[PDB]
Design a protein around this ligand. Structure first.
Ligand SMILES: CC[n+]1c(-c2ccccc2)c2cc(N)ccc2c2ccc(N)cc21
Ligand SMILES: CC[n+]1c(-c2ccccc2)c2cc(N)ccc2c2ccc(N)cc21
Lengths: 173, 172
């Protein structure tokens, strides 16, 4: 299909993000992906495997973003401003990160979603801890978790300047 | 004690787990332990159960917010007082789980956002006069993450760690 299967994994991601894990059905995914049901059943008779597929696709996207953050943080050479920017870009990219966001929030009370979620907090820590210490590293990721949830809740993100200022206070000393 | 109440509290639970669209008399009958949806139908023929469930959580949220307000006037060290209160909140996850679930969920469900906003708007107005907009907003944001990240990572920031990060953020 040149990627009918890949559209079904990408739909299933959004599905699971919106309805949860035990809220996966072939009908929904076909709807979600705009493909015939038979394509879904043919490629993923077993829904557990569609679940695995959908979580791995998110996990890949998560770790992929993190590596990009890694690349940017070495090169740029200024910490607060870089992190401020990277966060801003992310807060703005509502398309295609909704899901990672839908899942990360859900994981808050859903152990089965935490292996996927912990990649963010663990990954950020590995990135920052060497550069700023672990107390600072933890405090910053705490703030970022807040920045996203707070932005979504209130409907307005912190500006880059506001982010930069708060990061700088958290990393100072 | 009162079966109305037990049904609105169960409905809160169900909304917290299955969203709002997931709410049904049947699910609530189970969560409530009401013998049959029949008591559920009696007290709430239609789903103005949502409105009661949402208002019950609003009342609980405002209430805790009033408690924070009281505890703040009752001391001087703002940072350490906010930390203590948060530490207590993280330690009472069991009491406050449904509120937390609803808050998380509201990130992508606009219908849960009027309830959810009582927190940020509330903390903002509470602290803004003491530390100004910038700091009050930065603290609320940090608190949003303090709870989420504690849940995700399974380890909360300590009182000392909370106090330290808050002190950095409030300082003019
Ligand atoms: C999906 C996790 N997550 C969150 C996040 C999303 C929702 C709530 C809390 C944190 C995040 C939040 C902010 N502000 C900035 C960057 C990231 C991020 C960056 C990379 C990644 N692989 C996951 C990331
Ligand atoms: C339910 C909102 N909420 C959150 C919160 C919960 C989950 C995610 C983000 C913030 C909260 C988080 C921390 N750290 C400390 C206090 C509160 C709080 C306090 C009162 C209230 N009425 C709602 C509150």
């Amino acid at each position: 299909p040149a990627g009918r299967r890949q559209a079904i994994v990408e739909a299933a991601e959004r599905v699971i993000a919106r309805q949860g894990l035990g809220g996966l059905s072939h009908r929904r995914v076909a709807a979600e992906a705009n493909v015939p049901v038979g394509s879904t059943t043919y490629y993923f008779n077993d829904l557990d495997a569609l679940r695995e597929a959908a979580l791995a696709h998110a996990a890949n996207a998560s770790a992929d973003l993190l590596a990009q953050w890694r690349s940017d943080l070495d090169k740029d050479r200024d910490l607060a401003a870089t992190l401020a920017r990277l966060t801003t870009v992310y807060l703005a990219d509502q398309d295609r990160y909704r899901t990672l966001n839908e899942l990360y929030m859900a994981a808050a009370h859903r152990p089965e979603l935490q292996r996927l979620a912990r990649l963010w907090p663990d990954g950020l820590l590995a990135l920052l801890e060497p550069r700023i210490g672990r107390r600072a590293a933890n405090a910053v990721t705490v703030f970022f978790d807040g920045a996203t949830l707070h932005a979504l809740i209130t409907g307005t993100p912190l500006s880059t300047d506001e982010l930069t200022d708060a990061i700088a206070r958290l990393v100072a000393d």
